[PDB]
Amino acid sequence: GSVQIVYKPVDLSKVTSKCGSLGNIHHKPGGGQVEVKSEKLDFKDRVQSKIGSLDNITHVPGGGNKKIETHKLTFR
Amino acid sequence: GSVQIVYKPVDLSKVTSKCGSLGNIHHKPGGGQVEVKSEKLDFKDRVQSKIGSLDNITHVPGGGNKKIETHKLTFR
Amino acid sequence: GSVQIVYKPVDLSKVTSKCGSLGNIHHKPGGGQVEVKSEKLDFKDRVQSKIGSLDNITHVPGGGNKKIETHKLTFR
Amino acid sequence: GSVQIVYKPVDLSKVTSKCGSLGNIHHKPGGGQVEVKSEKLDFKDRVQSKIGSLDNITHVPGGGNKKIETHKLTFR
Amino acid sequence: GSVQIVYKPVDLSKVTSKCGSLGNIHHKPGGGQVEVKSEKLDFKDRVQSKIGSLDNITHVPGGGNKKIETHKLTFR
Amino acid sequence: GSVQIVYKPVDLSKVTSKCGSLGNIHHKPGGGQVEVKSEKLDFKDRVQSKIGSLDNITHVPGGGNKKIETHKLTFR
């Protein structure tokens, strides 16, 4: 026997923003506090952690648009 | 026997925003507090964690539109 | 037998922003505090951590748009 | 008023043993095994403990007789 | 008022053993094993402990006789 | 007022052993093994400990007899 695989996907796709102005943005949080206590940490085989992380962010992109795309073909 | 597979999807798509202005934005919270107590942490084989994370975000994109897409073909 | 694979994906795609002006942005947080205590840490085989990290960010790109794309073909 | 207290207990006591011989004494046990696992011990204000104590005693006194005695008087 | 306390206890007491001979004694235990695992020990304010104590004793006194005695008087 | 205390305890007491001979004593144990693991030890305010102690004793006194005696008087 025999096999033909033809794979021809098309995007004419668009992702877009139009905006006049980003105005006035004030970010004024009051002062926080964090405390943590433990005795042992013991991590094995593919581990992530975050411990004790007081964190303030202002993020004002003039458009933050995106496209995420994937293709897979597998044959056996 | 024999096989033909003909994969031809098409996107002519638009994802869009139009906006006048972002005005006046105030992010003005009072101060928080966090406390955590433990004795042992013992993590094995593909783990995530977060412990004690007082966290303030202002996020004001001039449009934050997205398209998320995948294609897969599998043959045996 | 015999096999033919014809892989020809196409993008004429666009990811885009238009914006007039980024205005006035004030990032004016009060002062924080963080404390952490432990006695042993023991990490093995593919580990990340962050411990005790007071953190302030302003991020104002004049457009922060992106495209993420992947292709895979595998044959056995 | 007035008080007289006249405390005069008497012991003419004997505690005694008489014995011929202690013969032949064999203490011949097979070997044991002990295992213990824990993580934390945290002791406060007047504590005793024993952990993991495989223990063989032969105790062959030629008489182990005893007298245990107390006297108390209290006045207010 | 007035108080007289008279305290005149008497012992003509005896504690005794008589024995011919202590014979043949064979303390012959097989060899043992002990194992203990933990992570933290934390002791405060009047503490005793023993951990992991493989122990063998032969005690053969030619008489182990005793008297324990106490007296107390208290006045307020 | 007035107070008189007349404390006159008496012992004509004896503690004794008589024994002919202490015979033949063999203390012939097989070989032991001990293992202990931990990570932190933290002791405060009047503490004793023993950790990991393989121990063999022979004790053969020609009589080990004893007398323990105490007296207390207290006045306020």
Residue numbers in the entry:
A (entry chain G), B (entry chain B), C (entry chain D), D (entry chain C), E (entry chain A), F (entry chain E): 304 to 379
Which sentences did the original study use to describe this structure?
The assembly of tau protein into amyloid filaments through templated seeding is believed to underlie the propagation of pathology in neurodegenerative diseases, such as Alzheimer’s disease (AD) and other tauopathies. In the brains of individuals with AD, a 3R + 4R tauopathy, two types of filaments are present: abundant paired helical filaments (PHFs) and rarer straight filaments (SFs). The C-shaped core of each protofilament, that is, the Alzheimer's tau fold, comprises amino acids V306–F378 (based on the numbering of the longest 441-amino acid tau isoform). Here, we describe a tau seeding biosensor model in human embryonic kidney 293T (HEK293T) cells that stably overexpresses a hemagglutinin (HA)-tagged region of 4R human tau spanning residues K297–E391 (HA-tau297–391).
We then used cryo-EM to determine the structure of HA-tau297–391 filaments extracted from the AD-seeded biosensor cells. Most isolated filaments consisted of two protofilaments with an approximate crossover distance of 900 Å. Using helical reconstruction in RELION, we obtained a reconstruction at 3.6 Å resolution. The structures consisted of two identical C-shaped protofilaments that adopted a “head-to-head” orientation with C2 helical symmetry. The ordered core of each protofilament comprised residues G304–R379 that were arranged into eight β-strands and was almost identical (with an estimated all-atom RMSD of 1.3 Å) to the Alzheimer's tau fold of PHFs and SFs. A similar head-to-head interaction between two protofilaments with the Alzheimer's fold has previously been described for an intermediate polymorph in the in vitro assembly of recombinant tau297–391 tau into PHFs. As in PHFs from human brains, the reconstruction of HA-tau297–391-seeded filaments showed additional densities in front of residues K317 and K321, as well as inside the C-shaped protofilament, close to residues H362 and K369 (dark and light blue arrows, respectively). However, in contrast to PHFs from the human brain, reconstruction of the seeded aggregates also showed an additional density in front of residues H329 and K331 (orange arrow). Whereas the protofilament interface in PHFs is formed by the antiparallel stacking of residues 332PGGGQ336, with K331 orienting toward E338 on the opposite protofilament, the protofilaments in the “head-to-head” structure formed an electrostatic interaction between residues E342 and K343. It is therefore possible that the additional density in front of K331 prevented the formation of PHFs.
